[PDB]
Design a protein around this nucleic acid. Structure first.
Lengths: 73, 331, 329, 324
DNA sequence: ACACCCTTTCATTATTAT
DNA sequence: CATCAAGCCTTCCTTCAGGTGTTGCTCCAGAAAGGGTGT
């Protein structure tokens, strides 16, 4: 580890405002009048994934030329 | 809709920055401790990456008015001048929570996490005023974005881009202004001057002995607060040309018409603060509506369809939308 | 295919961060308890490795916009400016699943796993919009990587690599901006001020007395209704600085590159990372290097004609049934 | 209401600015150390943005009187001349707290962090004087916005919108004016000049000895020599007195203050008669309402303020000044 | 008649650094 | 028409005022299960 381990918050939110505009215009065919951030298509969800900046060392048995081309891609 | 208006403050700008700032008697900002320092309320400074030298881009101060302050100024201008006259000239009336929602965004703290209906959100963003300032208990996304008031300065050169290289200021942009707050009865000099005071000379002399005892207590503390308070405050110098970038994400015709009506009624409004010292007085000398100059001295004299749409929509303005905006699902 | 987008923030950048951060009246962030601390919501920052002034690397705070935020910004500007206008022009509509798939990548049309044949995986990965993000019930891997918006700053020098030492900012790129909510009933001053209110003076005085009762209740509590008086802080990234933005398309078609190019053409109306009421995130695009070839002009993008022609033939050939069969079946 | 008080100072304006500024024998201000350095107090200077090359706008210092000074001057000629005679003529007497809240903004330097009830705010802002000047322990906002006194100068071209395009003074508007205080016991001369001091001439001799002691070496002798920068007399200034949704009594009180504005000094340098000024004009939202006898027109404002001072009472000042 | 939608409904701790 | 003085001194700041109150966040990031009803 080159860095202290930190945490990435990320969220998934479907835009309720844009969906309301599209539902009024009819581009979105949604009969339901109310969103739900707890669950469903409009679930605003929060999720935290751990983050490390480090040096990655792997030991194996393989041809040097073949691995180098794959990891160069 | 990318409204870029340019104003000229004819009186200093005092958007007071919160802090614990001091100043010497000479004018050095935040001196080292031990020297006699006076309280200073600095104006609102932002930091900005600017081009000093050649490619030596640095975070330099630029003293501004916050976009929250300018947003509330635009809101209260279109409220006191467009929304409320058209709402009193008919029989409509607001609840106290609806007034609170129309002015502060929300009717209270403690909002409901339950969202609002899709038809509700579409109708409220179709509203002339609610779609600009979407607050409420269920937090709408208001379609009006209000920028900070930036002085047209070299330190904002990366922000302004092009078209402002003339009438651009440089160098120092602010000024410390001092205030005395003199005790009133020290100015008392005669029996004719003291006849309005209960007791006359007795109460005045009693306050004088109280002042002497307080000064002795303060001298004992150095080695209850009086009416002598000498202090300073940093303002932005007047005569500056400022820019202000209103924007509207896919507006209704009436909403940008309401913004134009508030900009036309920006006359005799104060920008941030210092009401007693007249601070914040300004003259708009430009409005550009997607880049076309639509400000004469008489008024806007352009963008007519926005004005007819907002006239037809404040004709149809009522309190029902304001009341159902302010209504909490929890309450 | 690599696209480098160099932008310059015209307004402050504020990508809000979690956590209970506090600040005093002076700018001391997270003061120790036993002092007046105020709620602060900072910009999105991550620690990054940097080697400036020394050969070794240290963890420095770099204030960025997340790649998820810029990815959804690219998605939303393609939908708002290319995809939905084209679909409205053909008169096509989207279902709940197709909308939650195209606009959020969500699998709520079919929560249950949806099996996709390698052939249809190939055809939807060759779609101009669907192959860029994938998602939906199938959870298709997108052709598109949207990296974080990195400020051109000495902290970012490991991420930036070479070629950015000019116009490289240094020091702190953040500033605490103070915002308060005034109670407007306290600013009521006259009968003409209050006669738009039901009740008027009696309701106004009831609000005042309720506020003073709540204030005395809070003062006795210190030694649950929240009023409208608030005073808080939010750290922003200062305006005027320069950012890089990496968009790498993993073996794309020409129409997908054309769609990202149309996004960068129409993206000047959009805002980065929110702060919407304070106009935060407004920017201009200063450069676009298309595989290292600078293609950005002042008026959109000049050149790159095969991508524009391919995305043109894609959007006249675009219908919603691709989105419905990408979501449902 | 917007009020344009064009005044002309008859005597040199001196509103002293803070700062340990200095002056030489000549006119060099704040010199390098080692030269003969007399203390200088300068007038209040306001940086304003004006064209320097006619295409470039820079910050140029302009001498001003502060809006705080002009505001309290207006409050004192409005209070001392109208409010106090109306209170003593009806027998109304204020407390010392209400007296201080009248001339200053409040009675105590600690204001209570408490909003006042709306009926109190409505009665206070419908009051003429209290509506003009807010404050108090619960910190009312007044309706009067008083700007600084700007000289009509080419430095204030961006400050002054229109109407003065031919009446702009140009050049420097200040002069360093020198003052001193000799020790009078050095200037006796005669034994009949020491027949009024006790101890007589020898006692005066002792004072001279102290001066001789102070010529060799914290007490300070009377012999002082100093300077003050003043604005030049005869300058024409523009005063902006603005009003936020005013009642007619409030505008009438402002016009009563400007009507009998003549026998007042713009504050600073009282002993040298420095604040003496005359008013060349008063504009009431653009119309010229000033005459040689004072303010003509604005009749409804004068009748409203005349009906306001009748029924002016102590109890409103008491409830304005009373802390919660 | 089944997919879409609007309301209940139920689960248990616990301190906090920067 | 030319010099001849072509300054000397000494003052060369004084006292306080050298903030006060208030804000000192809000909320949500569930998803069956049991009812409806709308194509």
């Amino acid at each position: 580890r080159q860095l202290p381990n930190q945490m990435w918050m990320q969220t998934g939110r479907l835009s309720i405002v844009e969906a309301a505009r599209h539902r009024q215009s009819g581009y979105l065919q949604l009969r339901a009048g109310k969103p739900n951030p707890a669950g469903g298509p409009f679930k605003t969800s929060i999720y935290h994934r751990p983050i490390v900046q480090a040096e990655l060392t792997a030991f194996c048995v393989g041809d040097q030329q073949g691995i180098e081309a794959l990891l160069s891609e | 809709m990318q409204i870029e208006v340019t104003v000229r403050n004819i009186t200093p700008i005092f958007s007071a920055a919160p802090g614990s700032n001091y100043i010497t008697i000479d004018g050095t900002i935040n001196p080292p401790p031990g020297v006699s320092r006076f309280p200073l309320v600095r104006t609102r400074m932002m930091y900005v990456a600017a081009d000093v030298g050649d490619g030596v881009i640095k975070s330099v101060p630029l003293q501004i008015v916050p976009g929250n302050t300018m947003r509330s100024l635009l809101r209260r201008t279109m409220l006191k001048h467009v929304i409320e006259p058209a709402l009193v000239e008919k029989g409509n009336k607001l609840s106290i929570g609806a007034y609170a929602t129309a002015y502060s965004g929300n009717a209270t703290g403690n909002p409901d996490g339950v969202p609002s209906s899709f038809d509700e959100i579409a109708t409220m963003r179709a509203h002339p005023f609610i779609g600009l300032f979407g607050g409420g208990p269920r937090m709408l996304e208001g379609r009006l974005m209000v920028d900070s008031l930036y002085p047209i300065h070299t330190n904002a050169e990366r922000i302004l881009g092009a078209g402002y290289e003339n009438e651009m200021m440089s160098g120092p942009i602010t000024q410390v202004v001092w205030a005395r707050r003199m005790d009133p009865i020290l100015n008392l000099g005669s029996s004719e001057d003291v006849e309005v005071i209960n007791g006359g000379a007795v109460a005045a002399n009693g306050w004088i002995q109280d002042l002497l005892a307080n000064s002795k207590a303060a001298a004992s503390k150095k080695k209850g607060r009086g009416l002598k308070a000498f202090n300073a405050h940093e303002v932005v110098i007047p005569g500056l040309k400022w820019v202000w970038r209103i924007s509207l994400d896919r507006p209704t015709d009436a909403q940008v018409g309401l913004v134009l009506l508030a900009l036309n009624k920006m006359t005799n409004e104060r920008i941030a603060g210092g009401h007693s010292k007249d601070y914040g007085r300004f003259v708009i000398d430009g409005v550009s509506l997607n880049g076309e100059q639509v400000w004469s001295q008489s008024g806007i004299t352009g963008g007519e369809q926005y004005f007819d749409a907002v006239a037809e929509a404040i004709d149809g303005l009522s309190s029902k939308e304001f009341e159902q905006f302010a209504q909490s699902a929890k309450e």
